[model samples]
Target: YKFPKDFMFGTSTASYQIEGGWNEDGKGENIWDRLVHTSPEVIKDGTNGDIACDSYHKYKEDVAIIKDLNLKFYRFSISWARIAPSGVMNSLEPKGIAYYNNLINELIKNDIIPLVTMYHWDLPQYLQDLGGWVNPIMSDYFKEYARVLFTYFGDRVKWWITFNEPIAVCKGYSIKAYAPNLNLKTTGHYLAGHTQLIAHGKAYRLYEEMFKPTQNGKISISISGVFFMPKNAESDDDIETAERANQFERGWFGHPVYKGDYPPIMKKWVDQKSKEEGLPWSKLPKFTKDEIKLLKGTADFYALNHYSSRLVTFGSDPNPNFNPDASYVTSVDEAWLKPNETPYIIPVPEGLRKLLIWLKNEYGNPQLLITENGYGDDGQLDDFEKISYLKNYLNATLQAMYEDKCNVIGYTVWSLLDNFEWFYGYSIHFGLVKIDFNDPQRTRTKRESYTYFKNVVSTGKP
Candidate 1:
């Protein structure tokens, strides 16, 4: 199948994942730095991103690789702490600004459009100590950070993602699995999520007011879009259960951006659970009329990160803080063939098509950008499984755009290099070009999938 003529292709990477020089050149500490430093045991491989890929120093190499891949755009994150050491605008780091300036200039020189993600789960340690995302004032701090980014880089960067996957970032607020770890269970996740929504709204408003008139950049938060399917599509209960799962997962963050408030299903369920638990009010926070007004139409476009799909059915999870809040259990169907070593991903190409159509029907077909979609596997030179997964997923996207008339615009792979993977650490690799972690220089080796992807881009076929 052929992709659209105007469709853009790119590879993605986060600041904390690829940029080394963690504490260099006045760079401030972040939650991730504290996590791997203090509780190394929590990480599967006990490795950290302190020097992962060394992109901070070798960004030229990265841009070179992007050029070689024939990628038109490169999606990378700007470390908040790197630019503002205190997580405030008062103290700025010139070196950090220069680094990104150099990188962006190099990409522009090579005709590569830069897509920037403002924050990617790497909260400044200073902010985390002040209650991280749980504190409502964090929104103000984030707005200041966005202001600095827009003032500095908005001219060159056209695509801006305020935050990457709020659900994944909020997980760090509720559990010890992630940084600034706190087991606030019922309150932490919701509060963190609320702050991000407000922060996103504020940033979008700022860009619209100040930057859009002159800089003219598109901004949105990248929601992790997982298409939930019923285990028994014929069963009415199973079908409803799957939709509820989606509402709780993607819709929890997205509904507000699209519809101007939290999902009704979410508020109903959480309020009931809170009252039953003897709480004064619903654990799910309320939005003031002004807040709702700010949130509505906050996104200039819908940026989604979809990797795989899950089989969901009506069931209760013992943990109240988890997705069980929606009274649904998700599992991978053995029938859905696995193509990678990653535990959570199940290669379901059709699910991408379904999700795109669902977004169209649900959100009135906002412009869509596939921010992150790729296969995870152990570092392999001959990675046929990854190629197969990418091909199937790309084909599904084509089907969604051509057959379903989904307002899909572009696609970006999850990563360009194998770097730090949060708690999984360096164990899992999701890069088209392999990074040799043992090498001092962090050597890069393009895999077979690299050629496969280049061919797809060169010839409009998947």
Candidate 2:
């Protein structure tokens, strides 16, 4: 009874992770396909997702699983290569269109709505070859790309996400040398100013400007905002540090698009840092008067991909002096942590409520959608820990809504089935339905969390 009647309950997966048959059906190669194959050492298990869960061939089965779980919506992405092959075609790729049409049709046939993401990191290999995100010719495709999805599937798929965890794309590649997949790390700032943020806004604006008039659909770009918590929770310094963490991580990106420019706190920090480096003024780029006006409040909804928490009381407010290899990291114990080995993800349930309240206070109680949230276990089938984690986290959700009055509209779990997990490769599993990698078909099997999520979906209970 916690969720409102119209509130959506669902699970999510990206195209590359779940949809295998990377090169089948006239599908062109994307950067991820090349990235994995060329640099197998980049992945934790030295693996590539050549034939992941094989969802391209078995989406009907996955949609059936979604129906069995009683999900109101099934959230997934369309592969760019599948759609446009090389991200250059003026029209949609035939095979890509057919595959997605079949998938969308199957979900609709099962009475499930499709919350489709247009891009989920599978950048068309040709585009990356011709200068990836920064390319005007390449980035310009998003408008045409938005137009195609809106034109083809807009009637059936209403909720469209333009991008997923854009900060990962901006900050991950810009900062640090090489790629994170190949174990890249750095604490140094690689601020791309408002360039990436503007791209996000422009894509959203393109939809609003081009398609929304006809389609009348909602769109949001997913921002991976980590829930920050003070290590001591009550200390003034720690509280300040935590807020700054939010600014650097969430506000630096969110404020620019939502409020028209970078957060004031970011400006203050960038200014001081630049002066310290014998520079004149802030190196962060400035927005034109017209551009600023266009960017303000670009999203129809706020989509967050919060996994867990990092204790925020180790040093100064993201002091480069201390966190020489900073990555939204903070002081915390190891005893209570999971063995999955991804540093930032830890058990901190209360952080969710704090994060929601922060959004409410900062953004005027806008509708918030938990786009990606889940627990990771080390190759366990029963996954009782994951069940407990989900329950506690959603209970945190209920508390946030009732106590803080946060406008929470929907919740989509990180994944529906275990599959290819990028850098972590197949080692990390974040699915309610466990997928067996050993099997040729990569068979999906339900765990305890599967039943728990089904009950929540059925009852509208967190």
Candidate 3:
């Protein structure tokens, strides 16, 4: 399999997951900090990421690791609470500015491309207090925050990601799978997603109008698109089930970003739910024509962060609960989770190839980057399973590019250092480098996957 001449190979990490000093040097509290502090039991080990990997102080050493690997790029997220503290642009945290500025300069000096994610699930606690993503004002708040980032660091950072996994923020956070876990009904999740989409579109437009010409940078959102396989062959019912699942999971936001409107099936589902609930308008937020126009075609590249796949099956029950409102028809079958577990539980290498091909064909072969894809297992130095997972997945990626004609740009593993695994907490590890939490230095050791991944980056293949 052949890759493009400049195909980027690197890894990713988030600020909260690695960088400690959560409450130091005027850094504002994040939702994660608050969640763990108040409800530690929610985490599997009752452990919090108070001093995770401690990358804040050890970033220089981390840079050395990247240099050794001969990485082309290192994708990282800037902590919003660190920079804006209270999530307002007016208050600039000097310590926060210095931290990121130093990191960016170091990466550039070391000849490593810095991919900046503006947000990665670290909303300022104060912002969440003021309604967070659910509030309509969030669009303006996010735009203002983006303006600050662009004005400060836009010139140096060429690849900008407005948000990392916006759907997860809505689906997991609102649905109680992640931090600040609020078991919100369908209404809450839908509203949160609507606001985030608008916020992303606004940030993209803002960057384009104000900074693109002078900064010469590109902005895009990183979405986690899992492969949704049907339970059986492409029968009519199975096809419809797959389509509905896709509409809700990927196309809910993707449709607007790519096609300028919600999927027709999604609109129908919402309408039927609204009528059953006797509501004047659908619970799902409505996007105006102008909003759709602004959102459509906003990305310079489609940043895909896929890790696993799920099987979709239509339930026989007609009275599926839509959480608070029993009005909506649930197209997905929770019961089907038993039989269709092969591709979802086990890592099917070809699934990655299929996902890339599907995305390319569905979106007309837009420029794409595999921003995040890695397996999680309990921490072990050998970790042969994780290594094989990447080897096969990368091979599949190469297959997609070479055989499927997919314009794949880059591939970044989920993380470089072992840090906090949200929801699952620190129990699940998806890192090439293992961090010694009990050690005084918080020592990092290269796992077997590190050698394998480094070789791939250095030789351009497995």
Candidate 4:
């Protein structure tokens, strides 16, 4: 498999996952801080990110490690609290400005490309108090926040991501499984997505009209999904189910920004389901004609964070509880995957190839990037499985680019360092670098995957 010589390899991390100076530098509280603080019991280890990887104080060391890995690009997200602690124009934090400036300049000084994500689920807590993503007015707030980022770092950081995984925010709202947890399945999930897309559209417009001409930057949003294939190919019903499942998961966030409306299946399914669930109106809000025009084609690239795929069978059931009770069918056993190897994800390398091809055909093959793709481990220094997993998935990426003709651009692993892993806490490690959490300094150590990736980066082959 021949990856293009120009392909950029990098590692990714979120601000909340690392950077432990949560209360320092005039930074305000974020949704994650509030979530773990108020409900630490929910975290698997009863742990919080009060002091994550301590990257905030040691970012230079982290940068040195990234450069040592031979990676020409480094991707990281900016904490909303750091940029605008209160998630508004008035609460601008200067120290927040200082920190990012230092980090961005370090990357440039080292001749490494900086791909920064504007949001990675680290919403400022004050915004959550005002209904967070559920509130339609959040679109306005997010636009202002995006402008602040544009006005400050736009010159240095060329690659920008408006939001990372829009559906995760919505999916969290569905079951109260993610940050700023609020279980309003139909209303919260759908509205949160709408607000985020609206916010993304506004940000994209702001950058193109105001900043792009000056700085010449590109903006995109990262999305991920469980790729699906027919569980029982003998039956047409199963085939249809697989297609619908793909639409449900990917189209939920993708269709709105690309096509300016929810997928017809999403519109159909949610409209019918919510009506029967006794919602007074359709939970999915109707976008005005002007709104659609504004939101359509907002993204410059299709940023994907794909990990694995599953066999799927969807249905219209009798007891239509979209929660556990919905007409759901999913499995990895039937997908011919290495089961039980990883707790959260299975290895389905071909799925990435297929997803990239499908995305190409569906979205006219807009420039695409693997914003996040990596294996989760249990802190193994050897990390052989992680290396093999990357080889498989990344080879599939090359397959898509060469054989399937997908315009794949860059590939970045999930994280640079193992830090606070959301509800899973520090138990699940998805980083190439090891973090000594017990050490007061949170000493970062390289894993075998580090050497493996550096080899790939240096050799320009996989």
Question: How do the predictions measure up, each by TM-score?
Answer: 0.97, 0.90, 0.93, 0.96
The root-mean-square deviation over C-alpha atoms between each candidate and the true structure, in angstroms, is: 1.6, 3.2, 3.4, 2.2
lDDT of 2 at 305: 80
Q: How close is candidate 1 to the true structure, as a TM-score?
A: 0.97
lDDT computed for candidate 3: 0.82
Q: Pick the candidate with the highest TM-score.
A: 1
C-alpha RMSD of candidate 3: 3.4
- Candidate 3 matches the true fold with a TM-score of 0.93
**Model 4's TM-score against the true structure:** 0.96
Cα shift from native, residue 365, model 1 (Å) = 0.9
Instruction: Write one digit per residue (lDDT tens) for candidate 3, span 259-303.
Output: 888777778877787788798889887889899999998888888
Report how far off residue 264 is in candidate 3 (Å).
1.9
Q: What lDDT tens digits, residue by residue, belong to model 4 across residues 108-196?
A: 99889999999999999898889889889999999998899989999899999888888787766766778887778657777888899
> 3 or 4: which has the higher lDDT?
4
Q: Identify the runs in model 4 with alpha carbons over 4 angstroms from their true place.
A: 316-326, 334-342
